[PDB]
Amino acid sequence: VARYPPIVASMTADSKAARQRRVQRWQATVHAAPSVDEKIRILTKMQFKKYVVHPQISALNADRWYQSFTKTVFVSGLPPAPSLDLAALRAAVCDCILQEQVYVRRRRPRSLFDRRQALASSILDQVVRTLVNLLAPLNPVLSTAALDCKRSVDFYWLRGEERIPAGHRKGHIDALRYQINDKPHNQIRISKQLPEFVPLDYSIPTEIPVMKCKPDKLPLFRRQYENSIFTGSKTADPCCYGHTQFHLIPDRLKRERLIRQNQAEQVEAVFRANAIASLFAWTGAQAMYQGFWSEADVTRPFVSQAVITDGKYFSFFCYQLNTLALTVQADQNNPRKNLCWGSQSQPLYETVEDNDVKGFDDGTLLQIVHFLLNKPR
Amino acid sequence: VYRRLGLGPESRIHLLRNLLTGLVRHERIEATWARADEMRGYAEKLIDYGKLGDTNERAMRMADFWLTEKDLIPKLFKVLAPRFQGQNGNYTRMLQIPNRKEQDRAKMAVIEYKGNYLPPLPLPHRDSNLTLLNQLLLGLQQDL
RNA sequence: AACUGU
RNA sequence: UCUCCAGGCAUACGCGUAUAACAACUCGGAUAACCAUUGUUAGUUAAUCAGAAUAGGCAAUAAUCACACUAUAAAUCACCUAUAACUUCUCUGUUAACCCAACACCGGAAUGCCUAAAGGAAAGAUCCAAAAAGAUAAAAGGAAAAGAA
């Protein structure tokens, strides 16, 4: 009858094991937080210097670097898988706003450079509004959906660790902090989770990108500010899920300038980097709203889709979130990984002369129609 | 009857506690002569607690408090205590070592746990009986 | 007045 | 690894290489270990962080979760009408344990976030002198507790 005490490190010692034991005590308290809001506050109450991640960035292989920070595998192509007169939607998609850009009179921009960019925003907003109404009868989900215009989505995640090279804290171990802030042109928020495109724990031979150099070597800077995880709306909003996300690439990153800059190959990278960053951050926030965090991985896969357009070409991306444990401690033994499916950007039309649109491609619209018609089972 | 060490009486216990824990793990520790003598008494008394038995609640409480590392508690009852069951005392051996060349010239001594598997220390050897003086005394012994 | 090595 | 202590991280300002690695052990640290010293070499990466046209016409009604509601200390360019210009990402800031006090001075030093997950060590060794200082304990007694004027 020997009551041997557990063979564990002393809590009050100044050592790695003792510090780890103290860390566990705090992490136990996080597990003991009843409300989801309390969990977010505890995780973000302390502000520390962290990498600032831009969803749209010109860095080479930024999508690959983002995947390494996110643990996302990007498979090329779309994810594995009521008549409406597709021809009627070829025009009900409102070439009328393409007709209105020639009719609707508005005060000329002073800059003279934003004229092109302003035109693209007007058409996209009008097209989105009409499409939601046109597709509402077929898919009841669209009726209950919430449409967000140029609102911010934020996610804060930790992956990896680093050793301080110098200073008063030289040699101390600190985690690599990342923050993603995105403002999608449009996104749709629904109260019900979308249907999964593949069962959770799905495994493929492809491997996540690995980065040899430090994040700072690629242009990236750390700053200390509030840590935020946002789905595009507060937790009080009933629509804690979403249907689709819409993005518009700026003129600087458009194909013509990139080809002149010799970064023609990076056109797809810009599409991928924005899609992965926007969808992962947006998907991650949704899971946190459900109470799933790093030490409590999601029990159900979280899926989302987003479309990125350069003003003429349109690309479709689908993301599935499988792991919320991305920290070295939380991801120490995790077999699950995040999966992203993307498609190449395709033109939606050719030109708009006179007062009509010529060269409109229904195939891209069909993907939008096919995407919009999808609903949870 | 007690040396003044550390910053306070509790520190002495903690300092003694740390020294006792270190000795058990390694079985041979080098420290200042004054400190080594102070900790020698505690080490011998602890072995008596180990001999008392594992099931003894007081021994378990004493072992837990004195030994910070809990892996040592099985060792005391299954290594240290069984080893010295035959012996009635003198469990610890303390010997003088040349003073430290650390600019303070403190008195240095080595305290070791007897019966250990460590290499034998260079202990002093008494004069052999073959010496002329010893032989003469032996002759006196034989005559008597 | 109490309080206390005043 | 253990014992114990509990203002930490960013920016501003100032400082200006004190940063990091190597090599030295003479000088600097009011002693060593080790460097903050000596010599040599390296360093801080930004379209997102920070810094670096003109002439007329015309404006009554604070804020305080701004609604009610009052008050007194009385508290916010725009937009129109004409003229002029017509395709753009360079330059500069980014190191540090750092500053002002003759000093590696127990002093002074703004803001934001947070309160330990961050950040730290009172023991150069021995002795247990007197005397002195600080802290703790008081048998009986109470000027030889927090109550009144």
Swiss-Prot record, chain A:
It is found in: Mitochondrion. InterPro entries: Ribosomal_mL37/mL65, Ribosomal_mL65. It holds the Pfam family PDCD9. Keywords: Mitochondrion, Ribonucleoprotein, Ribosomal protein. It comes from the Eukaryota. GO terms for molecular function: structural constituent of ribosome. Its main location: mitochondrion. One of its GO terms (cellular component) is mitochondrial large ribosomal subunit. Transmembrane segments: none annotated. Belongs to the mitochondrion-specific ribosomal protein mL65 family. This is Large ribosomal subunit protein mL65. It comes from Mus musculus (Mouse).
UniProtKB/Swiss-Prot annotation, chain B:
It is found in: Mitochondrion. One of its GO terms (molecular function) is protein domain specific binding. The keyword Cell membrane does not apply. GO terms for biological process: mitochondrial genome maintenance; mitochondrial translation; translation. Keywords: Mitochondrion, Ribonucleoprotein, Ribosomal protein, Transit peptide. GO terms for cellular component: mitochondrial inner membrane; mitochondrial large ribosomal subunit; mitochondrion. Component of the mitochondrial ribosome large subunit (39S) which comprises a 16S rRNA and about 50 distinct proteins. Belongs to the bacterial ribosomal protein bL17 family. This is Large ribosomal subunit protein bL17m. It comes from Mus musculus (Mouse). The chain holds residues 14 to 157 of 176 of the full protein.
